[PDB]
C-alpha cells in the first residue's frame, strides 16, 4: 500500500544519510599514513614440517592455544590433532556427516567443535577420563548449512549458517540464547573479538555486520565487495578487520570509522580468495588463493612480500600461532605445511 | 631411537598407529560409487527413490555399493556447495513428462516442463561437471498417453507439428532434452522410459555406470 511506499522512501533516504555520514568522515587513505615507514625485506619462508595423512580435500584448520597443537578437517570424514614440533598425531576423531566446512579449538584445550552442510554443530570433549574423545553437545535449529563456529568461552559458542542467520548458544542447555538476523543471502564467516565482546560476520550478499553478544544488538554494517565474502579476521588490536572476497580482492575495514582502508588486488590474479589471517604484530596478512598458492602482503603498504608456493591445488585454510612462531597452510591436495 | 627419550618413543608409535588406521579406512571410500540425485520440484524424485540438509541413501546391486545423495531440502544457493560433489560418478536427473500442461504453482503461464528443461541445462554445463555423466529418467508415461490425446502438446510446443500420438511426441520431447548438451565428446547423456516398472531402473543405472568405469580405466593407462 501507500504506507509500504512511504516507508521504503524513508528507508532509502536513511540509506543516503548513512552513506553521506560514512563518506564525510574520511580525510586520507591509510596508505598515505603508512607510506613513511620502510617495507619489510623479501620474506623467505621455507617448509619446515609437512603434515600428511589426509586423503581428500582439506576445508579448515585452527591453531591451539599453546601454539604447538592444531586441528584439521577434510571430506574423508576425519578430524585430526597434530604436534607441530614433532609431526606426531595426537588424536583422530571420526565424524558423522562427511560434509564439513569448519572446525574450532577451545581456548582452554578441552573441546573442539565441528559441523557443516547438515545444519548441526557438534562439540567434542578431549580431556575426558576414559581416554577417548566423545560428543558433548549437538546444537540444532538452523535451516541452512553451517559456515563457521568459534568458542566464546568454555560454555558459550557462536555460529553462522547459510540460512542468513547467526546464533549465540549455550552448550549446557543446548538452546539458542540469542539469534542475529538481517542478512539476505547465505552467511559465510564470523570472527570473534580479542576480548569476546563483539564479533563480525560476512555473507553471500556482499555485506558484513558487526553484532553484539550481550543482547543481540546489530551495531554496524559494512559493504564494498561485489561478490561473496568467505573470509574475515580481526586485527590483533581489535579495532579493525579484514575481508577476503570471491572477486580476487581483499579489503580492510575499521570499526571506529566505518569506511574502506586497504584494497589488496593484483591484475595477475583473476581468481577469488579462500582464507585470510594476520601476524602477531599485525604486519603480515596471509591470503590463501585458488591459483594454487598463498600470498604474503605487507599489511601496511598492500604490496607483496612473499609467496608460499608449495601446493598442487587450491588453498582452503590458513593460520598463525599466538606466539608468532609459524604459519600453517592447508589445501585441496590434502597436505598441511608449517612455515617459519 | 638414541636421541629420543622413553616418553617421546611412545608418542611416535601412537602416531604410527593413527597413520595406519587412517590409511586402512581410506580404502573403503575409493571403491564405493557416488551418485547425486536431482529433480525439478515434484518431478518424481521420491518416486524413483521408492522404486529402488543432506539425505544419504544406501543400496547394493551386484556386489557393488552405491551412495545416493539427495540435496533437495537445501533451498539455498547452489554455487556455494555444489563443488563438494565434484568427484562423483554420475548425476541422476528425474523428471515427469505427463506434466506439460500442468503449470507450476508459481506462474499460471509457465509450465513445469520448461522449468525442468532449464534445470537440466543448468546442471549440464557447470565447470565442476565437465566429464560427469547424467542418467535421465522420464516419468509418469502412463498418465501421459491419456493426457496427450485430450489436449495437443502444441500448447507447450508452438514450433511443433505432429499427429499427437504416444511415440512421436515422446521421442520429440526426448530429442528436445538431449539437444541441450553442449559438450558431446567428453560427456554422454543416458535416457530411459519408466513409469512403475520394477526391473529396468536399477539395471539401467548399473549399465550406465559400468560403461563409465570401463572408459575411466581405459583412459587411465594411456591406451584410450
Amino acid at each position, epitope marked *: 500500500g501507500s504506507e509500504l511506499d512511504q516507508l521504503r522512501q524513508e528507508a532509502e533516504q536513511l540509506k543516503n544519510q548513512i552513506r553521506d555520514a560514512r563518506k564525510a568522515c574520511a580525510d586520507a587513505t591509510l596508505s598515505q599514513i603508512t607510506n613513511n615507514i620502510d617495507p619489510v625485506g623479501r620474506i623467505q619462508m621455507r617448509t619446515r614440517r609437512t603434515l600428511r595423512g589426509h586423503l581428500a580435500k582439506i576445508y579448515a584448520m585452527h591453531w591451539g592455544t599453546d601454539s604447538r597443537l592444531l586441528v584439521s578437517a577434510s571430506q574423508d570424514g576425519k578430524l585430526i590433532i597434530w*604436534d607441530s614440533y614433532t609431526t606426531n598425531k595426537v588424536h583422530a576423531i571420526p565424524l558423522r556427516s562427511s560434509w564439513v566446512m569448519t572446525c574450532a579449538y577451545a581456548p582452554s584445550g578441552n573441546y573442539v567443535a565441528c559441523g557443516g552442510l547438515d545444519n548441526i554443530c557438534s562439540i567434542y570433549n578431549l580431556k575426558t577420563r576414559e581416554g577417548n574423545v566423545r560428543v558433548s553437545r549437538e546444537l540444532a535449529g538452523h535451516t541452512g548449512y553451517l559456515s563457521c563456529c568459534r568458542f566464546l568461552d568454555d560454555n558459550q559458542i557462536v555460529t553462522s549458517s547459510g540460512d542468513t542467520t547467526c546464533a549465540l548458544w549455550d552448550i549446557e542447555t543446548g538452546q539458542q540464547t540469542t539469534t542475529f538476523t538481517g542478512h539476505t543471502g547465505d552467511v559465510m564467516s564470523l570472527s570473534l573479538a580479542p576480548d569476546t565482546r563483539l564479533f563480525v560476520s560476512g555473507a553471500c550478499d556482499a555485506s558484513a555486520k558487526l553484532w553484539d553478544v550481550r543482547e543481540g544488538m546489530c551495531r554496524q554494517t559494512f559493504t564494498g565487495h561485489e561478490s561473496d565474502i568467505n573470509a574475515i579476521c580481526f586485527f590483533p588490536n581489535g579495532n579493525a578487520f579484514a575481508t577476503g572476497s570471491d572477486d580476487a580482492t581483499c579489503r580492510l575495514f575499521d570499526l571506529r570509522a566505518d569506511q574502506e582502508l586497504m584494497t589488496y588486488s593484483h591484475d595477475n590474479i583473476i581468481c577469488g580468495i579462500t582464507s585470510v589471517s594476520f601476524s602477531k604484530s599485525g604486519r603480515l596478512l596471509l591470503a590463501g588463493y585458488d591459483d594454487f598458492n598463498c600470498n604474503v602482503w605487507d599489511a601496511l603498504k598492500a604490496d607483496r612480500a612473499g609467496v608460499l608456493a608449495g601446493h598442487d591445488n587450491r588453498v582452503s585454510c590458513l593460520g598463525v600461532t599466538d606466539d608468532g612462531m609459524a604459519v600453517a597452510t592447508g589445501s585441496w591436495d590434502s597436505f598441511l605445511k608449517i612455515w617459519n | 631411537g638414541c636421541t629420543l627419550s622413553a616418553e617421546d618413543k611412545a608418542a611416535v*608409535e601412537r602416531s604410527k*598407529m593413527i597413520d595406519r588406521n587412517l590409511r586402512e579406512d581410506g580404502e573403503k571410500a575409493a571403491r564405493e560409487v557416488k551418485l547425486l540425485l536431482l529433480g525439478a520440484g515434484e518431478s518424481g524424485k521420491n518416486t524413483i527413490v521408492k522404486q529402488m540438509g543432506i539425505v544419504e541413501t544406501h543400496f547394493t546391486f551386484k556386489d557393488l555399493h552405491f551412495k545416493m545423495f539427495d540435496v533437495g531440502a537445501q533451498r539455498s544457493e547452489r554455487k556455494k556447495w555444489i563443488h563438494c560433489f565434484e568427484g562423483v560418478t554420475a548425476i541422476i536427473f528425474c523428471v515427469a513428462l505427463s506434466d506439460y500442461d500442468l503449470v507450476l504453482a508459481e506462474d499460471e503461464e509457465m509450465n513445469r516442463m520448461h522449468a525442468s528443461m532449464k534445470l537440466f541445462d543448468s546442471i549440464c554445463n557447470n565447470k565442476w561437471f565437465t566429464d560427469t555423466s547424467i542418467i535421465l529418467f522420464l516419468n509418469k508415461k502412463d498418465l501421459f498417453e491419456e493426457k496427450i490425446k485430450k489436449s495437443p502438446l502444441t500448447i507447450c510446443y508452438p514450433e511443433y507439428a505432429g499427429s499427437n500420438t504416444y511415440e512421436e511426441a515422446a521421442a520429440y520431447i526426448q530429442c528436445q532434452f538431449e539437444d541441450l548438451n553442449k559438450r558431446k565428446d567428453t560427456k554422454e547423456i543416458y535416457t530411459h522410459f519408466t513409469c512403475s516398472t520394477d526391473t529396468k531402473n536399477v539395471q539401467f543405472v548399473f549399465d550406465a555406470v559400468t560403461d563409465v568405469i570401463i572408459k575411466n580405466n581405459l583412459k587411465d593407462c594411456g591406451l584410450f
Partner: single-chain antibody
Amino acid sequence: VQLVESGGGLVQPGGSRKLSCSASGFAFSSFGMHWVRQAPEKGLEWVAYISSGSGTIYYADTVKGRFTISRDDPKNTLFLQMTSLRSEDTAMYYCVRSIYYYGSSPFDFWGQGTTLTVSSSDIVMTQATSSVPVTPGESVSISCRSSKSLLHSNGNTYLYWFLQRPGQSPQLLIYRMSNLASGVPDRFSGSGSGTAFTLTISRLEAEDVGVYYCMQHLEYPLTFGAGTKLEL
C-alpha cells in the same frame, strides 16, 4: 574407570605364577601398561612395561629373561607371567596405566594391588631422611636427589612424586616435578633444579600424612629414592 587385578598368593621358590588385570571403564587399547612391585620391607621399583600395540617390551635388568608380559586387547585384559621366583620375590604388585602423547599425565590411575609372597648403569635417586615429625596447620618439605641432570632434550624433568596413605594404594601427586595431578587438593607442590628437588606442603591436614616417593623415567629401568614418612 577401574583396574581390578588378581593373581597373587603364596608360591614356592621354584614355580611360575600369573597376574592378570581387567580394565573396566575406559579405552584400554590406548594405554601403555606398567607393573610396579612394592616389597613389604620398604621395597619400591619398576618391574616391566608393555606399550599400546605390543611393539615395545621393557624389563629392569634384575628381571629380564624370566618374566613375560602380554595383552588381550579385544577383551581389555593385561597379563604378567613369572617363571623364576627367588626368595626376594615377595612383595605387592601395582598395575599402572599410562598414555604418552603431548600434554598427557602418565601414571595416573594406579590399580589396587595384589600381594605375592614367596616361600622361604642405573640412575640413583636418594631420599636421605626417613621421618619428619610435624603438627597440622604448618608447612612441611621433603627432599629427593639424583646422580645426574634430568633436563632432557625435551626439557622435561622426569621426576614423579606420589603418595601412599596407610592401608591405601598410591596415587599420582606431581608428574614431571612441576605439574599436579587431577583430583588431589592444590596444597601439594614441588620444586627443584639440577639433581635435587623438594616436595612442599603449605597447609597440613589429617589426610596429608603418609609416605612419599620419587620416580625417575629418563630411561628404563625406572629407579626411586627411599621413603620419607610423615608422622603425627
